[PDB]
Amino acid sequence: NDDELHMLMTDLVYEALHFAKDEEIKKRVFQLFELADKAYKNNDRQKLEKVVEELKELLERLLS
Amino acid sequence: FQPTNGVGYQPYRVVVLSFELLHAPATVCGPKKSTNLVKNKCVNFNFNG
Amino acid sequence: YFKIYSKHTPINLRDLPQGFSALEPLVDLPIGINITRFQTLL
Numbered sequence: 001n002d003d004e005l006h007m008l009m010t011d012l013v014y015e016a017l018h019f020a021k022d023e024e025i026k027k028r029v030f031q032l033f034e035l036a037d038k039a040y041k042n043n044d045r046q047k048l049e050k051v052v053e054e055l056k057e058l059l060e061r062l063l064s
Numbered sequence: 065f066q067p068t069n070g071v072g073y074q075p076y077r078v079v080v081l082s083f084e085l086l087h088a089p090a091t092v093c094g095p096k097k098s099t100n101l102v103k104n105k106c107v108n109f110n111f112n113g
Numbered sequence: 114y115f116k117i118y119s120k121h122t123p124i125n126l127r128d129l130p131q132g133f134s135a136l137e138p139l140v141d142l143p144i145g146i147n148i149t150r151f152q153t154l155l
């Protein structure tokens with residue numbers, strides 16, 4: 001589901017920014033958010049999924 | 065929000081009841097239970113206060 | 114508690130009439146208001 005995926009995406013963005021101690025991380029996360037936002041608006045499932053997967057990895061790295 | 069979403073993504077209605085007891089009269093409380101009135105017998109009674 | 118007592122009576126009178134009556138509680142407001150001054154509205 002595309003709305004469930006979008007909700008996951010914004011959740012990952014919030015947490016990724018929360019733990020984004022440096023500027024490079026914030027910039028990467030914001031770029032990923034923008035890409036996901038556009039993919040969602042244009043109903044592009046594949047672009048949205050790819051961005052979400054990258055955000056998930058990014059956050060796991062910040063947490064670990 | 066969609067009717068087909070999994071539970072974690074379903075909408076939930078939340079009501080938060082914040083309870084404060086500031087320096088003021090406090091008339092915000094539940095009902096005071098009453099019993100049947102008994103007459104012509106020795107009873108332990110409570111009428112209002 | 115802001116307590117209001119009152120009494121109404123007919124008069125035929127420039128001053129207050131002489132006589133006696135007592136005022137009954139009419140309203141009791143559980144407000145918690147800090148009152149130091151007041152005004153009368155016409």
Ligand SMILES: *[C@@H]1O[C@H](CO)[C@@H](O)[C@H](O)[C@H]1NC(C)=O
Nearest residue numbers: 086087088145146147148149
């Ligand atoms: C009520 O008025 C008194 C003065 O008579 C003042 O000392 C007190 O702080 C006031 N209480 C509140 C809640 O304003």
